[PDB]
């Protein structure tokens, strides 16, 4: 199936408390493989997957330089943005960058993306054709003109269409056992008496990989969402994921309600009813 | 491997 490689960067200023906190993190699909943390001792890109340890010292030095360079650009960005929005020097602000590439089941290039945010809001992003920029406001327009004049899109597209997909390809074969797996959800259902008039049915999905899953509640074949509650998919801590969905139901009518489970580790979608 | 086409805002 489809695969992805993504890198996530967070920088947060702490004026009066030294230089900004910087955390970088690498993922293949839903598996983390590298980190960098500026408050840690090593000051290096560190491994977070067993299959990436085998990379030699040229990889680790190279990744350390690139990541420390990402860090400095954000330090300057935090100062630049503080000025663009006329914010005070005393307050804490955030810069977030996310980029990467998607491939298909043949592992040919599918898609590329690069998004940038200031304080939790979209600032500037690369458009899907990978040749232009979306600028949200007046200050982002200044950034867009700067990045157009330095021809930044061209360099990014080159990384996104070449280097990114080739390293994705390499990681996928190196981490074959864990990266190309599908773990089907283990499904069960629970029942709780809220009142004598109301009842809650909870549909559980456990031990699954990848994290992408769909949980829907159906009544008599027609799906309904009006009394539905869905939690965020959560990591189990062992490389698998967990999720539930619940409905509030008139008790007695528990026979009318079916839960539908969709995941790429299911050959056919699962149905589940309280007997 | 991380990017090499990044510039300041």
């Amino acid at each position, epitope marked *: 199936g489809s695969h992805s490689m993504r890198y996530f960067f967070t920088s947060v200023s702490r004026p009066g408390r030294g230089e900004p906190r910087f955390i970088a993190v690498g993922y293949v699909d839903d598996t983390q493989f590298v980190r960098f943390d500026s408050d840690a001792a090593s000051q290096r890109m560190e491994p977070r997957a067993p299959w990436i340890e085998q990379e030699g010292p040229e990889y680790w*030095d190279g990744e350390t*330089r690139k990541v420390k*360079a*990402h860090s400095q650009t954000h330090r*300057v960005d935090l100062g630049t943005l503080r000025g663009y929005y006329n914010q005070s020097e005393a307050g804490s602000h955030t810069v977030q960058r996310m980029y990467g590439c998607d491939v298909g089941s043949d592992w040919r290039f599918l898609r590329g993306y690069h998004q940038y945010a200031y304080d939790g809001k979209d600032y500037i992003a690369l458009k899907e054709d990978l040749r232009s920029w979306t600028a949200a406001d007046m200050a982002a327009q200044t950034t867009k003109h700067k990045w157009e004049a330095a021809h930044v899109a061209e360099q990014l597209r*080159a990384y996104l269409e070449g280097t990114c997909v080739e390293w994705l390809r390499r990681y996928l074969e190196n981490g074959k056992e864990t990266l190309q797996r599908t773990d089907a959800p283990k499904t069960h259902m629970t029942h709780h008496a809220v009142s004598d008039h109301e009842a809650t049915l909870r549909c559980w999905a456990l031990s699954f990989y990848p994290a992408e899953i769909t949980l829907t509640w159906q009544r008599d074949g027609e799906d309904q969402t009006q009394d539905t509650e869905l939690v965020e998919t959560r990591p189990a801590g062992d490389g698998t994921f967990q999720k539930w969905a619940a409905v509030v139901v008139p008790s007695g009518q528990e026979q009318r309600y079916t839960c539908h489970v969709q995941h790429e580790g299911l050959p056919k979608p699962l149905t589940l009813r309280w007997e | 491997a991380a990017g090499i086409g990044i510039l300041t805002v």
Partner: T-cell receptor
Amino acid sequence: QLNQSPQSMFIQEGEDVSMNCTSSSIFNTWLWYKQDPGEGPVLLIALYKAGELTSNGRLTAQFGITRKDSFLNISASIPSDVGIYFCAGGTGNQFYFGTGTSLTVIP
Amino acid sequence: DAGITQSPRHKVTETGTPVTLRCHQTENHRYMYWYRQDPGHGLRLIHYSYGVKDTDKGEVSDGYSVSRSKTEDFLLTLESATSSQTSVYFCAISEVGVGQPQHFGDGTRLSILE
């Protein structure tokens, strides 16, 4: 670390000049610089994608498919094209420089 | 219009003399580099710097140290003060980002004589 070849070549005025580099390492950016005597390297071309680029008019350069190779071409050569030319390869946010190729144009 | 001034352009001194070379740059935030150039070897990186008080070593840093007390200045000081450090020395600059091309100063001719 880059092997540039040859260390000093010769062209007659008006001809075409071709110029190359080599490594066993992968590089994601290729740069070509010219150095005039008494001065530092001046950037001629920056190559990013594996393909064809022209940022002088008279200079064309190519990034290799294997990313271990690059070349520089000069057309309708002229006496001021005299100088030391250098390739630079980019990986891990570092540039690695070839050892110099030294052109002299015979008038 | 590079904005780099190397000082001095020429220095002749005996072994045992520490020599500081200065690279001045006028455009606020910049990555800065010191290289040496020698006949059979091309350009070799000595030390480089991603911002104020942040420096790291390149391939030929042995015998050299480096200072970045402010954004405008990157000082290379020849610590060992030795005849093998006879070279042409080149400061370079790069825009703050990842992988941006470097632009060089005009050079320093340094001869250390025994």
